[PDB]
Structure 1
Amino acid sequence: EYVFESPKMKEILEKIKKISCAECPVLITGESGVGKEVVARLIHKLSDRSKEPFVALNVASIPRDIFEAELFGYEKGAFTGAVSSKEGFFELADGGTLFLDEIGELSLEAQAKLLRVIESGKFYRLGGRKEIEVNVRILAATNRNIKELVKEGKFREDLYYRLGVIEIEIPPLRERKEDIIPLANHFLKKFSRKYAKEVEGFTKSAQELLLSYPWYGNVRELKNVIERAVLFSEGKFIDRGELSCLV
């Protein structure tokens, strides 16, 4: 279902296969639309935690004042309105994988709240006096440059070394030129099957056009372009005229 034809992507696949026995947290970095989610789910699938939960969490959608309650849970009577005990996402993802998406959007006052949990795995619930120990593997994804954010001062240096034991960098689509045509054919077949059209390839000029456009949205932009071309097709082959949005 996934296309890995560029040599860099095959090297990344070899790296993923070599760390299938590890439990250290992983840090995935790149541009937008390069496939960080794909790589994260592939890392989860090939490891020993294949059947274990995969909790994907967007850390930017958690309100500031209830961050601790969401992450760690609370006990009964902790505050006004706490009518029953409730667990957090670290207990929910216990024994499995926790995937923190867009870790670079977290604020400096919220990054300090998960410094001991990532390394030790032990924490206290809100209002609880017993220490809870969990076994969670942490994958983190970011589209920023953390190694530069820490130098600037907008990212805590204490969290980068806790998260970045293993670092993966996914190159942009404009450098994986051996993947543009296979991905185009894959998306074309998928969307032709979905919309019941009768297009079954590209012309010798459309392929040349697809290899020169500097894809800035990467694979997501390529997918959108292919879907739009399939929706408005008129024959059996896609010509350069249809792909006029490129250039």
Structure 2
Amino acid sequence: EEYVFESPKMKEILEKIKKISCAECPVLITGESGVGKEVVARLIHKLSDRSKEPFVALNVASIPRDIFEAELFGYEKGAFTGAVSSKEGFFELADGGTLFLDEIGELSLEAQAKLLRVIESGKFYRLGGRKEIEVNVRILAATNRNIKELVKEGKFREDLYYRLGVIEIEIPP
């Protein structure tokens, strides 16, 4: 059988997804919990040119704020007591495919920045030093909070907003 989309506003949103097909600009999805955000990311990617490519979805809340900037990107050896190898990255694992960051508002100012830098340059370095890796990952942010607000609270970098705010989809409860 199939999936489920039939209400006007969604009859719509599906198409918006379909059009966005041939694209790679990041996408910002927003709706209350349960509305289908992460279901749209997944669909956007099933529809993007890189459907067959991996889907690296990671809940930004499912990781202590102090280790996100260690697992998203990666880690350069001996910089934090105990390192079995410079740590790879979800960015690197998502290289060539999609990287669905769920619950964006929960990004530390430090990573909010560090992401921005990788959304524009596409290059990143694991900790102190310089970039030595090439990643081609389409950003897909989804959050249930109101981004704009957070911007006047200073909890959310504005320039990072507009950067992910290329394509913006809003799922109605």
TM-score scaled by length of structure 2? 0.89
The aligned counterpart of 1:17 is: 18
For residues 126 and 28 of structure 1, what CA distance do their matches in structure 2 show?
29
State the alpha-carbon separation in 2 of the partners of residues 125 and 78 from structure 1: 10
- Residue range with higher mean Cα deviation, 72-81 or 28-37: 72-81
The superposition leaves residues 22-47 of structure 1 with CA deviations (integer Å, 9 ceiling, x where unpaired) of: 00000001112211111111101011
- Higher alpha-carbon deviation: 102-111 or 44-53: 102-111
For 1:176-223, what per-residue CA distance to the aligned partner results, in whole angstroms no more than 9, with x for missing partners? xxxxxxxxxxxxxxxxxxxxxxxxxxxxxxxxxxxxxxxxxxxxxxxx
Do 2:65 and 2:107's aligned partners in 1 also have CA atoms closer than 8 Å? no
Counterpart contact for 1:124–1:130, Cα < 8 Å:
yes
Stretches of structure 2 lacking an aligned partner (at least 5 in a row): none
CA distance in 2, matches of 1:153, 1:129: 28
Q: Percent identity?
A: 100
- Distance, in Å, in 2 between the alignment partners of 1:58 and 1:66 is 13
Alpha-carbon offset, residue 109 of structure 1: 4.2
| CA apart distance, 1:130 | 4.9
- Aligned runs of 1:1-247 on 2, under 5 Å? 1-126=2-127, 129-172=130-173
Conserved? CA contact 1:72–1:123, under 8 Å: yes
1:81-115 Cα shifts (integer Å, max 9, x gaps): 11323311111110000000011122334422322
Structure 1 range deviating more: 124-133 or 100-109? 124-133
Bigger mean CA offset, 71-80 vs 101-110: 71-80
Residues 104-156 of structure 1, C-alpha deviations (whole Å, 9 max, x = no match): 12233442232201221101123665522210001110111112222343321
Q: CA deviation at 1:9?
A: 0.9
Bigger proportion of residues as helix: 1
CA contact (8 A) 1:74 1:127 kept: no
Deviates more, 1:38-47 or 1:66-75: 66-75
Task: Assess, with a 3 A threshold, how the Cα gap between structure 1 residues 90 and 109 changes in structure 2: closer, same or farther.
Answer: closer
Q: For residues 130 and 20 of structure 1, do their structure 2 counterparts lie closer, same or farther at Cα, with a shift above 3 Å needed?
A: closer
Instruction: Judge conservation of contact 2:60–2:68 (CA < 8 Å) in 1.
Output: no
Higher relative contact order (CA 8 A, sep 6+): 2
- Greater shift after overlay, 92-101 or 142-151? 142-151
Cα gap change, 1:26/1:82 in structure 2, threshold over 3 Å: closer, same or farther?
same
Give the CA deviation at 1:77. Answer: 3.7
In structure 2, relative to structure 1, the CA distance for the partners of 1:129 and 1:139 (3 Å cut) is closer
Structure 1 unmatched ranges of 5 or more: 173-247
Q: How many residues align?
A: 172
- Give the RMSD, CA atoms, in angstroms: 1.9
Give the conservation status (yes or no) of the 8 Å contact 1:77–1:127.
Answer: no
Q: Work out which of the two has the higher radius of gyration on C-alpha atoms and give 1 or 2.
A: 1
Distance 1:135-1:2 versus aligned 2 partners, 3 A rule: same
Length-normalised TM-score, structure 1:
0.64
Within 2, Cα distance between the matches of 1:4 and 1:130?
A: 42
Query: Which SS does the other structure have where 1:99 is aligned?
Result: strand
